[PDB]
Amino acid sequence: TTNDTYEATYAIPMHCENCVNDIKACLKNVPGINSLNFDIEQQIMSVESSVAPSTIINTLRNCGKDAIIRGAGKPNSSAVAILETFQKYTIDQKKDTAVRGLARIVQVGENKTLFDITVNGVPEAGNYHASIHEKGDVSKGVESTGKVWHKFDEPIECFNESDLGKNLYSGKTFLSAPLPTWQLIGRSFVISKSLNHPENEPSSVKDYSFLGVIARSAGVW
């Protein structure tokens, strides 16, 4: 049925001669694809299929191609959330900025959203967890954002060395949810992990979290 098929746009470097040809060979045997359309100039590929974006992205990765979700210019379809800490932590000594992550969001189809999540510069290595809280009021940090509205089960593994600090960690993950962008905007995107040593935190806080309001975006990244 029509609700089973949808449109998704990906940014993929394709200036080289065999560039487009290799991408076509890469996806030729993937079941469920109705069409692949390329825009060499903009270096983007539009895919109409019943194939989960993680699959398209996963397959492209298997072909050595880095595909990044991108907005297709349709109204209220793309969003972004700049994730920052909202309090001091004994373990977090990075003072230049409070930003620790970024969530890029694009809606594909009527009730499907893909989340390109990046974490960079956290002081404690480990598995981080993402969720969307009901409100986007960050006047009091996570406290003012209300209850968990959507929980993502897939952890964000952060064990890589950060390019922001030799002693910091980074991680990346790609998630999806059966939600449209209009239900996400204005809410808060939160990533957190239980502190390894809460005793040393005078804040009496138990979790290390960074979050941001989900904002409308052009999706041109």
Residue 109, judged by CB atoms within 10 A of its CB (0-12, 13-18, 19+), counts as: middle
> Which position among 33, 82, 164, 175 is part of the footprint of a second copy (CB under 8 A)?
82
158 close to 196: Cβ distance less than 8 angstroms: no
Using rule CB under 8 A, residue 95 touches a second copy: no
Using rule CB under 8 A, residue 106 touches a second copy: no
> Which position among 112, 129, 135, 172 is part of the footprint of a second copy (CB under 8 A)?
135
Using rule CB under 8 A, residue 132 touches a second copy: no
Q: Match 């239980």 to its residue by tokens.
A: 194
Closest distance to a second copy from the beta carbon of 106 (Å): 13
Closest distance to a second copy from the beta carbon of 99 (Å): 10
Single out the residue of 189, 190, 187 nearest to residue 207, CA to CA.
190
Residues 144-163 that bind a second copy (CB under 8 A): 146
Closest distance to a second copy from the beta carbon of 112 (Å): 18
Q: How many residues lie near a second copy (CB under 8 A)?
A: 24
Site for a second copy, rule CB under 8 A: 76, 79-80, 82, 102, 134-139, 146, 182, 185-188, 212-218
Q: Which residues are annotated as a binding site for Cu cation?
A: 16, 19
